[PDB]
Every structure is written in structure tokens, then in C-alpha cells.
Symmetry: C3
């Protein structure tokens, strides 16, 4: 497309919402290619990541860890206005794994506090893709400070199975998984700091052990439980988008399955089926499609169970509906 052709395309301004929720969108594209406009303000802020009051100096796209999910369709243009307020201390940028050129956009979006930038890229490939900050010489530090999210580039005709049959979800959730490395004292108590830079040297030491102190969904242990448990009903079709910008994960829906899983996150790669546990490498997003068949509480985990149940990588689903005794029944309840 020429500069003139792009200029003539319709514009749509999207309002982003906080994960695990996803902004309003259509699965099948409405009309032809558009320039889809997003704005995110970067917030450097303290976050509390466990019930012991452990703190991380988060570097958060749109004020959240993970950053929000941006949804476009194949061959749309994604136009991001990225803002780094004067209240921040560090330079930031953005690398879209979905984008082609200039280190995913990182080379064109380096903004100091008090600066903003506008990047436009063509979403040529359908799938879920990681995005993250990557300042030269400071890359993993920003990423493991929570400065990452994902986008979804839907096929223009929506999702399909390996045989070309349409797959249409009722609900979509975005689970961003984060590896944290909290510094040791000598007593084994987590250290607190009053500036992000003050934590750098100590954090780098922990990072280099390749052993996270916490592995969490949505920025904290138990984040996606209770008041933030995800919800569904029996018969409901749900897409779970899962990202990890720095480290491998292995999602599993306890009590369920991944009926269709784009484990690589790319929609032109046929999905795996009937999955118990899928695998998403560090630096990637994946997506799982499931139709709920049983009511009750589900746990959604990274199935290294130490990571899930000692380090924090566990979410819940609360599912309504009728129990199916054909699928599962207690013939004899626990008894003497």
C-alpha cells in the first residue's frame, strides 16, 4: 500500500481495558483494513506481589502488569501513541513481536520522561504476539519489571480449526505470566527500595541465577482468584490468551483441557487438539480454546507445580451450570 492509500483508510480509536479482560472487538473483521489507534501511558510504580508485602518496582504499560491486550485483524495497521510522563525516571520503548523492522519498533520508540511517540505498523501475520520494552543495554531488566504484554491479530474471517471450520468464542481472557527476581537480605527477607534504579544491581544478581523468586499471573500471587477469578458457564466457549515475555511456561486447566491450542500462538499454524498441558516458550504468546462442560471451580496453572503452588502461578475459574454425571461421577464418596 502507498502512503496515499493508507491515509484514505478508516480510523478507529480503541479504549483499552485492564487484563485479564479484553477490549471490545469483533472476531470477524467489520469491513476492510483500518488504522486501529491505541494510546498507552507508561507508569513506573510500586506493586505488591505477595501476601508478605513483597514489592516490585513495576514498569507498566497502561499502569498494569501485564500491559493490556490490543486486538486488530490481519492487514490492519496498529497505530500506538506511547507516552512516557515526566514523573517517570527511565527511558522506555516498545518492541512488537507482531511488527517487522527496527527491532519490532524499539529502535523508533525510545522516549525519555516527558516524551511521547507514535508508531504505526502493518499487522501482516495472524496470531497472538508478545510486546515488551527493550532499552538497549537494559532489556531484560525492563521486561522482568513487568514491562510486557501481548496483542492479538485475528484472521479477517475469525478463528478456524485445522479443517477450516469456524471457531467462535463467547469469552476471551488474557493471562500475562511474569517471572520476578526480588532481592538474599541475609535473613532471607525481601528487600524494599524507594527508587527503581536503587534496585538494579541487586536485581541483576538474582536474575543471573535464572531462578525467579515469584512466578505470577496479572502481577501478583492470587491476582486472578476471588474477586478476580475468571468466570464461565457450562456450554460457554472461552479463549485463553497466555503470554510470557522472558521465560517458558506450560499452561494447564485443572479439570479441563485445551480443545484447540495454538501453542506457537500463530493462527496459520494448525492448532493442537485435546491438550492436557501446552507449552509456550519465553518470548511468545499462545492461545487455547475450550468449551466448558462441568460447573465448579477450576484452577489454571503453569504446570510446574512448584511454580504454580509455591511461586504463585495459579488462577481460578468459577463456572456455573449443571453437573454432568456421564462425564464424571463419584460412585462411592470418600468413606471408611
Amino acid at each position: 500500500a502507498t502512503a496515499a492509500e493508507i491515509a484514505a483508510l478508516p480510523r478507529q480509536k480503541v479504549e483499552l481495558v485492564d487484563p485479564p479482560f479484553v477490549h471490545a472487538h469483533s472476531q470477524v473483521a467489520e469491513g476492510g483494513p483500518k488504522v486501529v489507534e491505541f494510546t498507552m501511558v507508561i507508569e513506573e510504580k510500586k506493586i505488591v506481589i505477595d501476601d508478605a508485602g513483597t514489592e516490585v518496582h513495576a514498569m507498566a504499560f497502561n499502569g498494569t502488569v501485564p500491559g493490556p491486550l490490543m486486538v486488530v485483524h490481519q492487514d490492519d495497521y496498529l497505530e500506538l501513541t506511547l507516552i512516557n510522563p515526566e514523573t517517570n525516571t527511565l527511558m522506555h520503548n516498545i518492541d512488537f513481536h507482531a511488527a517487522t523492522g527496527a527491532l519490532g519498533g524499539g529502535g523508533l520508540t525510545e522516549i525519555n520522561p516527558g516524551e511521547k511517540t507514535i508508531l504505526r505498523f502493518k499487522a501482516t501475520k495472524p496470531g497472538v504476539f508478545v510486546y515488551h520494552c527493550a532499552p538497549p543495554g537494559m532489556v531484560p531488566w525492563h521486561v522482568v519489571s513487568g514491562m510486557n504484554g501481548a496483542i492479538m491479530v485475528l484472521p479477517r474471517e475469525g478463528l478456524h480449526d485445522g479443517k477450516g471450520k469456524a471457531l467462535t468464542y463467547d469469552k476471551i481472557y488474557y493471562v500475562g505470566e511474569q517471572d520476578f527476581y526480588v532481592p538474599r537480605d541475609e535473613n532471607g527477607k525481601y528487600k524494599k527500595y524507594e527508587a527503581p534504579g536503587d534496585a538494579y544491581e541487586d536485581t541483576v544478581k538474582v536474575m543471573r541465577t535464572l531462578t525467579p523468586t515469584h512466578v505470577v499471573f496479572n502481577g501478583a500471587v492470587g491476582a486472578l482468584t476471588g474477586d478476580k477469578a475468571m468466570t464461565a458457564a457450562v456450554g460457554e466457549k472461552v479463549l485463553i490468551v497466555h503470554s510470557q515475555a522472558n521465560r517458558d511456561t506450560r499452561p494447564h486447566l485443572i479439570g479441563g483441557h485445551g480443545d484447540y491450542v495454538w501453542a506457537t500462538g500463530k493462527f496459520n499454524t494448525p492448532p493442537d487438539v485435546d491438550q492436557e498441558t501446552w507449552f509456550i516458550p519465553g518470548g511468545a504468546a499462545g492461545a487455547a480454546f475450550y468449551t466448558f462442560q462441568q460447573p465448579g471451580i477450576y484452577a489454571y496453572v503453569n504446570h510446574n507445580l512448584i511454580e504454580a503452588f509455591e511461586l504463585g502461578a495459579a488462577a481460578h475459574f468459577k463456572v456455573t451450570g449443571e453437573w454432568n454425571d456421564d462425564l464424571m461421577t463419584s460412585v462411592l464418596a470418600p468413606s471408611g
Copy 2:
């Protein structure tokens, strides 16, 4: 199916066998859907996991690590009687990754010492699947104490490749891989404990390092070697089912390949072919089909070679038959330059 219809189905009681062997089963389903009945008694037991005499307080389905492989066909029902004897100290349950609902059955099978339960589920999806204990608040401790195994849900028409051609194995082995996290004293020597509970706090510390002290097949370093080495012959078709309930593995047959590998373990997902090293994520089972072409000793390993040869993740095959010089030959044996 209605309650009346399920009640009308044939019942078949199966006697389980110890890994790496698999009970008789057829491969192609014989007749219509059935309710296949299994019984397992849970044993909390001391096991020795290396030649030094390192002990683990194992929590063992059917008294073995891994628990035994249960084999059914798609749309059969698996009906498990699970028994927690009064001689045990902990509550246990079971999560079948193959099952749908109540945390894989875990929510319906919480049994205290002196209790039993019977769970029935419909095996709706074909493949190999992990099962493991998962008591709320104590999940990884039970799993990494060896309380896990796998099942196989065969398609009713047996196995096929990605293109609809039948794949019929001559024999099957189940390799359960276990990460252990054994506490050490100040001398760096593995600690021994009187009671399972005495080891909890020390073990959780090691678990949090995400670095196992031992990574083993069939419950111990060298368990599948010597007179316990797996066996095959040139021309023999072998299915190797491999599970890891907690941690990633990367199986490799040294001297061989995986001709067809269901790396995700699910038979409706077409298998990868001609594999050197496959990958099974923690919390899953996979399966590899191979026809042996050369005689001699093979090593079957987790191909992080530190895990294989330092931490214990190596098994052997003994293979009978005629050497094939077309496939491989020593043109010049090691000799002076």
C-alpha cells in the same frame, strides 16, 4: 449417555502391573464401550533412589513410582477404586488429566487414612495423560514425592499415523520420569528422616530452587538398567510412553530415533516424524513409536545430558539381531595415525 445406559454397559476388571510394563490390552477396541475397573492402594513408603542409599519418603499409587499405566479406549469409562490405608498419615486424592470436572477428579476423591472412594469418568479424548495426587495446599509436595503416573486412552481403532495408516506396536513400555528434591546437610550429604512430615520444610526449600537433586526413571537412578534394562529386537515396533507430572523433559533414544512422536501425547494431534529429541512439558505425557533397525545397547535419556548422566535420567535397551552395515559401518576402527 443416561444413567440407565451406563449401568447396562459391560464391566471389565483389570489387574495392574508395575512400570515399565503395561497390563494386557485388543490396541483395537474389542466390542462396544465398557466400564473398565481399576483398584489402587496408596502406600507412603521409604524408597532408595541411588546407589549411595539416598532415601525418599515416597507417596506411591499402587506402591510404585511412577504409579502404573491404566489403559482404556476412547469413550470407555474408567472406574477407579482408590484406597488410602489407615497405616498412612496423609490425605490423598487423584487428578486424572484425561477427565473432565472437579479438578480432574481431585475434588471428589479426597480420602483420609482409613478411607476409600470410587470415581468414574468418561475417557472422551484419545492420548496418554498424566494422573497425580493434588491435595489442596500440598500439591507439588505429593507430586514430587512420586505420587503420579499416567493413563493411555487408545482410539477405538488403535493408533494411526498423521495420514490414516495403521500403526501397530509389538510391545509397549511406560517410562515415568521423576524430579526429586532431597535435602542435604552441611557436608553436602543427603539427609534421612524418621517420618515423612519431618522432611517437609527442608524439602520445600529445595523445591523452591527449581533444581532437582535427582531426575530418575522408574523411581531410582539406574532403575531401567542391567537385568531391568528394556528389551527389543531388530524389526520390533516399540511404543515408549513417557510422563513427567511436574517438570519438562526431552526424551532421546541414543542410537535411535522417534519415528512417530505424539509429543503432546494426544492422538488426534498428528505425530511429528523422524525425531532426534522430543519435548514433553511438565504436567504431560508423550508417546514415541520406533522400529529398531540395529542390535546392541541403547541409552534412553532426558537429553539435558547433565540430567541424564549426572542426575539419573538414563535407561537402557538391550536389542537382539543382525548388525546392518548399510546403515552404519566402521570403515576404520580406532587405530594409530
Copy 3:
């Protein structure tokens, strides 16, 4: 084939080239099956792997870490003369993952210093495959001392996509990734040793932590960056072969993609498409095909970004050509 038929096959000697470059070959097979002959001398030598003068006693096929890429076609034979000079102090051998029998050849190629051996095997399966030394009882020590490489067994009709359309590369690079486990003294300084064996006990202790001190491409931090960056042009089709003989990796082309990725490395397994980050398990090789669309500097990394940017697993591509504003443009450059 009969005994006379095998003996009647042409023999061809090939001159090897140091990684990341690859020796002369044709993508489509030229003529019928051949016995392709290679020679490699094993070198035990001290190498410097980082900017701080850190030493490894390398055990190097053909004197390089990784060993060179050998290229044949399906149903060719690979016939390797392996030489262990009397100046070396250890026994070595070779396990070809591409080969069938005798522990990949390891059982037939155990050569003491002052010995040589010739192994022939039929390359029955198409793909990229690891090779490595594997002396019984000291296997990981040799491998993590850099004694590993890869081969490529091309289909006789060259590469194809999942739909059977031909994929012809303009150039090929081989990136061997190495995990090193370098002992440190109590002050955190890396230790030096007189002879390879002197480091054995200390090195195994580090190995058992499963935490490399260094993760590098082409044998050293920054070996494929700066003036040693790999090169391409806009419109050029590049195959990147990547191997890791001992430990998982997750390759990512920053600013690009893997258009077609044989993540398992086997060409009869259909390639994944539109990949952001692919996954190669320890003990395997993979291959990614990409057509460059934007000029400039790219980074090519293991996308555990701590491994990439703290431990050394980062390479560069320098790409020439015209910038494509349709694919990506800075609408507003960083500004107040």
C-alpha cells in the same frame, strides 16, 4: 541396495568451513546417492569466552565451537575421518543424532590421543541433527566443553513448505548455542586451570546447578555481533540452522520472524509458520527460513532475555536495502 551397489557409489571429499558459515552444497541433490567424505581434527585448547578473559578448556571438533555444519542429502552416506592428535590428553568419539546404531556412532569411534577412525552411516532421515562427543561416563563434560555441532540432511528435492511449494534460500548460517559452566572461587572470580582434567570436579559441581555461567553463540559472548554480525539484504531468503546439544533454547529474530520454522528440525514434519519465537529442546537442532523485508540492525537471541543480554546469547544481522514505510513508520518521532 546390494553390496556391489553400495560399493559402486561415487565418493566425494568436501572441504569444511568454520561456523557460522557453511561449506559448498546444492539444495537440490546433484546426481544419485553419494558417499560424502569429511575429515575433522579434534583440538583441545584454551579459549576466551567473555570480555573479562574467562577461559574454557574447549574440546573442539575441527578446532571450532560449535563444530562445523556438514551438509548431505537424504540417502547419501556420511563418511567421517575423525582424528585425535597425540598432543591431546583425552579420549573422544562422535554421536551423530542423524545416524542409526552404536549410540549414534559413539560405540565405534572411541579414539585415544594418537588415534583416528573412519565412520560411515546412511543419512536415512531429512533434517538438521545434532552431533556431539560422548565418551561413556564423561558425556556431558565433553558436550558442555563445546564438543558438539550439527549436520543438515537435505531432502533430495530441496526444502518445501507444508503445501509442497519449494523453499529456496539465498544463504544459510549455522548458529551453535553453547551453555558453559565455569567454576568460580569464593570471591566470585572465574577460575583458570593448567589442564582440562584439573577443572573436572569443580566444573561438574557447577553443571549440577543446571545454571550456566555463560550461554553463547559461536563459542563466545558477542562472537556474532559488531564486525562479525551476519548479513542479508531486503528480499533475501535466509535459512538459520540453530543447535543446542545439552539445553533448551528459544530463538527469536528481533525485528523479524521465522516465516517457516522446522522447530523439531525434521523436514518431514511440516514447518510452523509466522513464528515470533520458536523452541528447540536440548539435544536437537532446528531451522528457520525468513525473507528479510526491512533494512537495519537485527538482534537474534535466545528469548530468555537474561540468557540473551546477561549471559551472552545474542547475535546480530546487518541488513541492507530500502526501508518499507507500509510495514512500519514513525508517525511521530520521540518528542516532548
